[PDB]
């Protein structure tokens, strides 16, 4: 296939799941049991960009939805925001630069470098219930790293 994808959850260090708050927001907050069905299912794909051994180019998008998370200046601040595209274009394997994370991997978890805006990461609050944002700060109070679970498809 042109464009490669994978479909996956992905999980904070601190066990929390990510779910869709509002119409283009992300939360998270630690689920289990039942609720588990909740969490957003990503299909990530693999576009172009500078790649390396240890980090790779990728998009992230709502599998079957034509929503992907975008990073963003909004009110002189690089922000984390869900964006709607033209489901016919999409996804594809040059996407715009701000669709565009380095995703990394250390220990044995992840981290989601921001093509757009270098040293910036898609980080989740220790607290609960809390907007999954884009931060500037790595291995302070934030959660950046994560684990990757594949689904079934």
């Not at 996956?8 to 929390?16: E, H, I, N, V």
């Not at 998008?61 to 998370?69: P, S």
């Not at 757009?116 to 607290?127: D, G, K, L």
Request: neutral net charge.
């Amino acid at each position: 296939a042109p464009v490669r994808s994978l479909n996956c959850t992905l999980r904070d260090s601190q066990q929390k799941s990510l779910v869709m708050s509002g119409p283009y927001e992300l939360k998270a907050l630690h689920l289990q049991g039942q609720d588990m069905e909740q969490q957003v299912v990503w299909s990530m794909s693999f576009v172009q960009g500078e790649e390396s051994n240890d980090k790779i180019p990728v998009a992230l998008g709502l599998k079957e939805k034509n929503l992907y998370l975008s990073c963003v200046l909004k009110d002189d601040k690089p922000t984390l925001q869900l964006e709607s595209v033209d489901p016919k274009n999409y996804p594809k394997k040059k996407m715009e630069k701000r669709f565009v994370f380095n995703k990394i991997e250390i220990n044995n978890k992840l981290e989601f470098e921001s093509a757009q805006f270098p040293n910036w990461y898609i980080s989740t609050s220790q607290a609960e219930n809390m907007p999954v944002f884009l931060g500037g700060t790595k291995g302070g109070q934030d959660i950046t790293d994560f684990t990757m679970q594949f689904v079934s498809s």
